[PDB]
């Protein structure tokens, strides 16, 4: 069983390929979508209402 | 009535502890209870040892944590008013006060 020191991606799945950045969304190192602006420019109570109605008698 | 009373004080911060103890000893000595003043007790270095990393993986740096608690004893011989006045003032920053009957 050979298993080998040569790139052996864990995964990882990333050994050399990793600054070539996928997603196609921005891409790494900033820019542009408007950014970090521009240099250019009675009345009582809970407990005793319970006591008052403790008058059950039964 | 003479009651023999031992006040123990435990708290952390160096300079504040000194000034709280100083006032109590001086006021006691001024009003000649004759004290036996400041028993300076060894500061307990409470040591916790941890890895600087949440999630272990970098070249083993350790951040270790210490805390020092300073204990100091003052003995008063007096009753009614003098006991309760001298205990209740010097109070405010971070002092735990224990008064023992004897």
């Amino acid at each position: 069983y050979g298993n080998k020191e040569s790139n052996g991606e864990f995964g990882n799945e990333l050994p050399q390929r990793q600054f070539n950045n996928r997603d196609n969304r921005g891409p790494p190192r900033v820019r542009t979508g408007e950014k970090f602006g521009k240099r250019e420019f009675k009345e009582e109570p809970k407990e005793m209402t319970l006591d008052e109605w403790k008058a059950i008698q039964n | 009535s003479v009651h023999r009373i031992r006040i123990t004080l435990t708290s952390r911060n160096v300079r504040s502890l000194e000034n709280v103890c100083r006032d109590l000893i001086n006021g006691a000595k001024n009003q000649n209870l004759r004290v036996k003043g400041p028993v300076r007790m060894p500061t307990k270095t409470l040591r916790i040892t941890t890895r600087k990393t949440p999630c272990g993986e970098g070249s083993k740096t350790w951040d270790r944590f210490q805390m020092r608690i300073h204990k100091r004893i003052i003995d008063l011989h007096s009753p009614s008013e003098i006991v309760k006045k001298i205990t209740s003032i010097n109070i405010e920053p971070g002092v735990e006060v224990e008064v023992t009957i004897a």
Partner: protein, 95 residues
């Protein structure tokens, strides 16, 4: 939750009395300090029941559920126990 009605009333009375309850998130403690009548997980879920018909605002900080009883909630929990409106919660006063 699916909780006995006696226990349902027990949470609501006690909650409104203090205006405030705090419960450690730990599913079945059994009986959490304070509410003795009721399993704590049932407390948690019924106090959450109370919460999004708010009534109560939850500040969750430490997995520990801090529940404040807001003023619309005093009117309706007052209605639940019925006890006639001019009921003051814990709005009263000791300096």
């Amino acid at each position: 939750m699916f909780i006995p009605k006696a226990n349902r009333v027990a949470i609501y009375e006690y909650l409104f009395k203090e205006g405030v309850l705090v419960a450690k998130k730990d599913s079945p403690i059994q009986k959490h300090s304070e509410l003795d009548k009721i399993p704590n997980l049932q407390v948690i879920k019924v106090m959450q029941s109370l919460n999004s018909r708010g009534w109560v605002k939850e500040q969750f900080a430490w997995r520990h559920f801090y529940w404040l009883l807001t003023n619309e909630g005093i009117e309706e929990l007052r209605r639940y126990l019925h006890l006639p409106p001019e009921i003051v919660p814990s709005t009263l006063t000791q300096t």
